[PDB]
Amino acid sequence: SPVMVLENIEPEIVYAGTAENLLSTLNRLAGKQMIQVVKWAKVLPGFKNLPLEDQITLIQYSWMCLSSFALSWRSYKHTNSQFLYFAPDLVFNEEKMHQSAMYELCQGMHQISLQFVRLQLTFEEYTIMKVLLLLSTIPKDGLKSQAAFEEMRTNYIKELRKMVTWQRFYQLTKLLDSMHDLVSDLLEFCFYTFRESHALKVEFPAMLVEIISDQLPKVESGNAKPLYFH
Ligand SMILES: C[C@]12CC[C@H]3[C@@H](CCC4=CC(=O)CC[C@@]43C)[C@@H]1CC[C@@H]2C(=O)CO
């Protein structure tokens, strides 16, 4: 059953409208995308039944994984992965990557987009993997309904199996582990531009200000335990 509902609840499109200007713009796009993210999550099978608290945590702990992974999907569906399709009005060229002073991070997300096309990823696999990323980062000590959380997660994993079936399941779950590596780098650059936003002149909406404000204190503390498949 999950296969369908997941596919029916997929979001639409969001617009974005020197490093400082670009970065600030991306943080704007991010804040708007986030409501899109929350709408998609609220009606997610299994997930929606967890206490409200657990849903917030899971989201804030994965907002970057979800933003990054989704960008790749978009860069793959709209440009054959030859560009970074952040939004219809903001597609990154080799140049803007440099222009953004976030080049290698950009190359990082781009390389994910390259796997998608190389692997010929399908929307079904994407949907399930997206859910998995939403359930891959949890507090070091757990959540209020841990057992419920674990059962649900292992089920989405089995769901991805039935989906792919075995090199496929490996290639797909290894890419998700990879996502963890890229997301740690992004978050460091984020915590930096955030911490020194006034010195760099980098802006943050308010949704992001409240997500990042809880995030780094506990992430730089080692409390955000990433879940790996391999
Ligand atoms: C958080 C960030 C700006 C916003 C983006 C993020 C990378 C992933 C991403 C993809 C999107 O489609 C929406 C914007 C966004 C969420 C960047 C990594 C570092 C950068 C900064 O730290 C600039 O302040």
Please report how many Cα atoms fall inside a 13 Å half-sphere around the Cα of residue 159, on the Cβ side: 22
Q: Measured between alpha carbons, how far is 58 from 47 in angstroms, rounded to an integer?
A: 10
> Could you tell me how far CA 91 lies from the centroid of its own chain?
18
What CA dihedral angle connects 4, 7, 8 and 13, to 10 degrees? 180
Among 18, 26, 103, 219, residue to substitute to test ligand 1 (most atoms within 8 Å of Cβ): 26
User: 224-226 and 137-139: which strand pairing?
Assistant: antiparallel
Reported structure resolution in angstroms: 2.3
Among 186, 197, 204, 219, residue to substitute to test ligand 1 (most atoms within 8 Å of Cβ): 186
* CA proximity to 127, closest of 78, 182, 164: 164
Residue 27 marked as a ligand binder: yes
For 78, the token pair is 């709209």
Q: Measured between alpha carbons, how far is 122 from 4 in angstroms, rounded to an integer?
A: 14
Does the beta carbon of 26 sit less than 6 angstroms from any atom of ligand 1? yes
Residues near 198 by Cβ (< 8 Å), separated by ≥ 6?
none
Give the phi and the psi of residue 82 in degrees, each rounded to 5.
Answer: -95, -5
Beta bridge partners of 90: 87
3 state SS of 20: helix
Which method was used?
A: X-ray
Give one DSSP letter per residue of 137-158, joined into a string.
Answer: EEETT--TTHHHHHHHHHHHHH
Give one DSSP letter per residue of 60-123, joined into a string.
Answer: HTTHHHHHHHHHHHHHHHHHTTSSEEEETTEEE-HHHHHHTT-HHHHHHHHHHHHHHHHHT--H
* CA proximity to 189, closest of 200, 179, 178: 200
Q: Does domain 1-230 have CATH number 1.10.565.10?
A: yes
Distance 162 CA to ligand 1 centre (A): 33
For residues 26 and 5, the answer to whether their CB atoms sit within 8 Å is: no
